[PDB]
Structure 1
Amino acid sequence: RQMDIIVSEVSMIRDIREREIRIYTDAGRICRPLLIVEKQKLLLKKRHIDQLKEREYNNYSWQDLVASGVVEYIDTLEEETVMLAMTPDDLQEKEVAYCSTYTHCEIHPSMILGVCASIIPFPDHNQSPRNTYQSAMGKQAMGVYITNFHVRMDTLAHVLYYPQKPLVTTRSMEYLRFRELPAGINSIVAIASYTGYNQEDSVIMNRSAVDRGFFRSVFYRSYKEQESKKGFDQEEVFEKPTRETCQGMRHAIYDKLDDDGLIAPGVRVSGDDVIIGKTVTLPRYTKRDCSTFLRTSETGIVDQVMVTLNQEGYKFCKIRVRSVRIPQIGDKFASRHGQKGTCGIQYRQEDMPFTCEGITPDIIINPHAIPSRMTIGHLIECLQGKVSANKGEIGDATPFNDAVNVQKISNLLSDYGYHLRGNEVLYNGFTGRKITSQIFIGPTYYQRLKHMVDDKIHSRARGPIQILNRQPMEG
């Protein structure tokens, strides 16, 4: 604890019943930081918090906190000998003392979660499989994967037009930089049965919201190519092919290519089009077409073309093509609670149900997705988000927080002229009649997932066949 000869990552376990003292300095030991506890008292005093508050002036950092003997890294094997306080409230003298001999305290229990589970708001109000499914699906959510995406020639990349930070957030996301590169949009979710097009894990989206850019994304796809001069026997070269010299020329037109054989940026390209005109010298004479076509049925625009030399040093070309993906029926969307579903139908703003103040939901999800799944975090997030949007906040959905429960959120929401439980009177968009049931509606953070239907739809009728067995190809 003094940063003397023993470094911080050294584990020192005393098994008492068997008289071993096992000291470990090797690598690969997973450990975590914990607050040391005096007799029944944190060593972390207000002086440490004060110095930490001005961390940017007096260069008082974490590593001084460790050097002060206030924090300690404990490995899994040494936890067996440690008596942990979940919070300093456990250190507090009680009518019946549970332990009274604690040695360490959690900094915060929410640090048991990882990167993707630290995104979930109110994860302790969900069934745990739902938290696992979200931790999986946050990795398929679109956003801005990195700030310098304009210069990266990634094979596949999805960028959301209008990423938003969640209105209801956890205090862990401040370190995941989710606020700075968020992967979703706050959507006005109504949980309702409306026309039957959201049944069995499906959603009804607002066509008008989609027209305004709601969950619109851009898909970037990069195509490689290189002209190999491996030997005088045969050499490839980028050049606009010609019908008179090239042998394996498809019937697709090559007019979009330039002299150099490379398409130019800003050119609209449809499926089966040519972006690189490459010809290889033969042993329809003395050169055969080996051009690069678009991956079929894409219909994008050439975002940019880069030319350079590879390691060995022949020409090398990268072409990024850009395709705007507007959400549509069959695109998969998810909240942060394992509630995934495809778009069942899109209604225009006049067809959607509306509140007395003409707010239509961006998304309508079916109430039958809640009861078996027990994703109460979804409902609490919706209510907290209504409070946050009406109050001008960002809600605190950190997992284990006794200063935030459903009652106090409901009391807050009732102060803004809303039903305290997040229900509203909606009117049928088609007829304008009030719906007899008051619908639960509010802001919820939704995610657009990589799984778009246009990348999955496929059909065949007498296409190509495999060489070995003359059967249809795969994929």
Structure 2
Amino acid sequence: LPAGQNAIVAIACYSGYNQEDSMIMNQSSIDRGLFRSLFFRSYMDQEKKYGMSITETFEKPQRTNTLRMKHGTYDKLDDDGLIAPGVRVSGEDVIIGKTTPISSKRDASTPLRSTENGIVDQVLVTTNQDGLKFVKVRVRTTKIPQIGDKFASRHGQKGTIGITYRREDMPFTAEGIVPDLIINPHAIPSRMTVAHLIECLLSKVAALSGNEGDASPFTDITVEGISKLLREHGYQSRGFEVMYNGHTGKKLMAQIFFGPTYYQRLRHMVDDKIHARAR
């Protein structure tokens, strides 16, 4: 049950867009699926507590004497007051269309979260111990690494996507390989985050060699040994790779430490934190 993927990672000053803990992510990689994620927000709503025939009804409301509803459209709820699976829901669309007579139609209902938008994965109708009617709506959303999304290697350094370049523009290696992910070298000396480098070194050998790379602490494994193995695989042993600027094709004057590295995609995604409450 792994949590992350092996990014082809370049430590490079590239376009200037990966400074101060951003990352230039490869947009093409994104397209082909790299770091996509499902996201299941499942909402829950109940029926009435103790009210002497003051029930709450999961059904479609269309305004009568209180009109107290929300701006989201009910055009999506079925006549049982529940979106059925499959139905794409966005904006502030109502999901659990609920109603309550209070002492005829005071709408209390769960609309989809403002910033969110998905597709319904499963609506589930249950019974409690007090026999209360339960509804659980799972709303599925596919989340595509954008600008702002946060990514951390396995060594306590996160960083966001600054920009995504397409494969064309990325700086490429003689092999036609191009990085999924360009990080900045200035992130390195000051963290002392050598593991990241040695994992990266290893991760390369590993990929090349099919052999799972033992990066366990207190093994007798060595940058020098991992170096030797990479070297045997016909790459320069310290990880570097001559690379060609994508715009021009010209070689990069400097060589770019290149390698797989396990990156984790962390939650709290851009779209959840764009909250712009101008009033």
TM-score by length of 2: 0.96
| Structure 1 alignment gaps of length 5 or more | 1-180, 463-475
Q: Equivalents in 2 of 1:400, 1:354: separation in Å?
A: 35
Matched pairs, number: 279
Please say if 1:433 is aligned against 2:253.
no
Q: Equivalents in 2 of 1:316, 1:275: separation in Å?
A: 14
Cross-structure match for 2:89: 269
Cα contact 1:355–1:427 (8 A) shared by 2: yes
Q: What do residues 425-470 of structure 1 show as CA deviations (whole Å, max 9, x unaligned)?
A: 00000110000001110111111011211111111122xxxxxxxx
Matches within 5 A, 1:124-135: none
Q: Equivalents in 1 of 2:73, 2:232: separation in Å?
A: 66
3-state SS of the aligned residue for 1:198?
A: coil
3-state SS of the aligned residue for 1:243?
A: coil
Residue 243 of structure 1, CA deviation: 2.5
Aligned to 1:189, which of 9, 26, 31? Answer: 9
Distance 1:332 1:252, change over 3 A: closer
Cross-structure match for 1:216: 36
Please say if 1:368 is aligned against 2:182.
no
3-state SS of the aligned residue for 1:214?
A: coil
Cross-structure match for 2:62: 242
Q: Equivalents in 2 of 1:229, 1:411: separation in Å?
A: 70
TM-score by length of 1: 0.57
Give identity over the alignment, percent.
Answer: 69
Residue 246 of structure 1, CA deviation: 5.0
Residue 231 of structure 1, CA deviation: 2.2
Distance 1:272 1:448, change over 3 A: same
Cross-structure match for 1:203: 23
Cross-structure match for 2:201: 383
Cα contact 2:71–2:92 (8 A) shared by 1: no
Please say if 1:333 is aligned against 2:147.
no
Letter in 1 for 2:245: N
Cross-structure match for 1:407: 224
Cα contact 2:68–2:105 (8 A) shared by 1: no
3-state SS of the aligned residue for 2:257?
A: strand
Q: Equivalents in 2 of 1:423, 1:249: separation in Å?
A: 61
Letter in 1 for 2:17: Y
Residue 340 of structure 1, CA deviation: 1.2
Cα contact 2:200–2:260 (8 A) shared by 1: yes
Q: Equivalents in 2 of 1:315, 1:427: separation in Å?
A: 63
Cross-structure match for 2:100: 280
Residue 233 of structure 1, CA deviation: 5.4
Aligned to 1:296, which of 106, 114, 124? Answer: 114
Letter in 1 for 2:225: K
Letter in 2 for 1:455: D
Residue 282 of structure 1, CA deviation: 3.3
Residue 287 of structure 1, CA deviation: 2.6
3-state SS of the aligned residue for 2:140?
A: strand
Cα contact 2:23–2:183 (8 A) shared by 1: yes
Higher relative contact order (CA 8 A, sep 6+): 2
Residue 406 of structure 1, CA deviation: 1.3
Residue 339 of structure 1, CA deviation: 2.0
Q: Equivalents in 2 of 1:253, 1:411: separation in Å?
A: 63
Letter in 2 for 1:274: V
3-state SS of the aligned residue for 1:282?
A: coil
Letter in 2 for 1:267: V
Cross-structure match for 2:142: 324
Cα contact 1:246–1:279 (8 A) shared by 2: no
3-state SS of the aligned residue for 1:394?
A: coil
Cα contact 2:72–2:111 (8 A) shared by 1: no
Matches within 5 A, 1:16-165: none
Distance 1:186 1:252, change over 3 A: closer
Cα contact 2:117–2:141 (8 A) shared by 1: yes
Q: Equivalents in 1 of 2:218, 2:67: separation in Å?
A: 69
Matches within 5 A, 1:225-236: 225-228=45-48, 230-232=50-52, 234-236=54-56
Q: Equivalents in 2 of 1:452, 1:399: separation in Å?
A: 32
Please say if 1:258 is aligned against 2:75.
no
Q: Equivalents in 2 of 1:400, 1:412: separation in Å?
A: 19
Distance 1:261 1:245, change over 3 A: farther
Letter in 2 for 1:230: Y
| Structure 2 alignment gaps of length 5 or more | none
Letter in 1 for 2:91: G
Cα contact 1:355–1:426 (8 A) shared by 2: yes
Q: Equivalents in 2 of 1:209, 1:330: separation in Å?
A: 16
Q: Equivalents in 2 of 1:400, 1:229: separation in Å?
A: 59
